[PDB]
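Researcher: Following up on the earlier apo prediction. This time include the ligand. It's chloride ion, with the SMILES given after the sequence.
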Amino acid sequence: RPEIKQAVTVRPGMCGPGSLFVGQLGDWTWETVSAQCDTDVFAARDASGNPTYLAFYYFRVRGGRELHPGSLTFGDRLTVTSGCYDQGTESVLTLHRIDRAGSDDAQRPLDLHEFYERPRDGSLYVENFNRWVTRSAPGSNEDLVKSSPPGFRNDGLPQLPAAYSPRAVYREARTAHTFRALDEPGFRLLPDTVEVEHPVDIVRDVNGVGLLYFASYFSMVDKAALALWRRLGRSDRAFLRRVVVDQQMCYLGNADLDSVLTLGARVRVSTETPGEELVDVVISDRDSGRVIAVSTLHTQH
Amino acid sequence: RPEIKQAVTVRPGMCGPGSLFVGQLGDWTWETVSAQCDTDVFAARDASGNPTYLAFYYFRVRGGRELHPGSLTFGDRLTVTSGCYDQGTESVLTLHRIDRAGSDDAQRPLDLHEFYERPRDGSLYVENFNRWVTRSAPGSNEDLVKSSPPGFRNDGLPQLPAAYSPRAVYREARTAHTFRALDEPGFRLLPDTVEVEHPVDIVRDVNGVGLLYFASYFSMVDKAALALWRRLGRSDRAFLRRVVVDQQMCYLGNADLDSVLTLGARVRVSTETPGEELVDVVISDRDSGRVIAVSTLHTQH
Ligand SMILES: [Cl-]
Ligand SMILES: [Cl-]
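Model: Understood. Below is the ligand-bound prediction.
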């Protein structure tokens, strides 16, 4: 299996202009997969005894003006509905819908059509596509290898039709370096861009197993975004006021803890709605020749 | 009421060399006080309708070689025991003991004597002393004012004897700028110190209500500590390996989101045990003339 409903009171540890909300989202994904695929995701190991991690690969957060991540304050009552979909033995799709606890029809079950074609204002839709991986060498964060812990059961799971394919979505972003095609009408590109050098921050960016922490990617993207916001003369206070109505992240790789990353950012402004923009950020590990992440944010000023 | 026992599987969102574990600790304090003092801490308001926050004031984490925060990895099974103690109507003390789920006598209730005079190796002891506050002016983070939400019930709570007084502990650290008196025998002070300028990081340091986030203070301290670790030639890899067996933080103030903070750090090395040190960090808001935090860490290299 059944979907997992929970009543959630918003805590300081899962809101604010940082990456704490996304961190909460991923911990619910690992809990939801554990419950539905008969596997202790937290302590997962492959037959050798190697630890295997249910790594974040594609991550979407979509809301809108009436509920977005920046709308959440301490003490807000929410309803969270969660469940997995079959993507075979090495990968799994986890969905989360978040509603205000009061709201009309908050009890409704997950609905792929709603998530993928008819998103409602006032609901927050989370898509986490995750893939089992292991280190290819102790202490290396490069060249992660595909895994599946023994006993991972995808068989119970509901099916996704071919139209809703996280795989397609991420393949196109890896190629284009945005999740919103550069020729969408109704946008024009500004000439101002930034390229920020970011040494891995070993106090804030690293997780419990010595990999870069998946929520830190959101922090790196917001750092590149802030830099651009600043390069084009806007205020720190207005930055804290931006409304992020949609954001997608593809995790192409991890990195070693001494790497120097590069954070590239660009923005397109709406020619219809004032103050609506698309910001694209690419995170590179120049030294290994890899793009390790791509993110697009859809914002209202 | 009764103490709150929970079985906890360690998640990526509450471990690692960052401040995520301390963030988890504070969310359990707010849940524990909510349960024992009949108050929704998350959504607390005073009679006017002003939001009132159960602010972190004094924070201790004490473990040891057999269990410290850096010992926790994904999937670890823990037992957590929590409860509040009466400190009147404007403040409350919350204790948490954390044991490995397997261990001898993990079911035992909280014991003030154990916490304050006989801490056991293999247990982690958390002390959170918190005070209700409100903003004195919309959008200001300075000059917070004492509060108590209506209906806060400290009456149920067990009593603390005069010997165990968080108040005394913090008063001495505010004066001395360490929690370990400068004349403790068995330590000598190194001449190397650092002073790091730290503009408030609006993507990573700010909480859901626009105040500096209490766990960010731990990140700022670790930044000042890393700087010192580096100034005296040690490796990033060895920094990730430090064992923090005790840490205390006093939160003297908050700061506005455009402040530039100063992070001061010093270290004393053991003359008995090799590789045991005390690192003291002071966080200043030069421009308002305030010390906003003091922290001492007891480490094994
Ligand atoms: Cl992670
Ligand atoms: Cl906080």
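Model: Residues A 12; B 207, 211, 213-214 surround chloride ion (ligand 2) (CB under 6 Å).
Researcher: Noted. I'll compare it with the apo version next.
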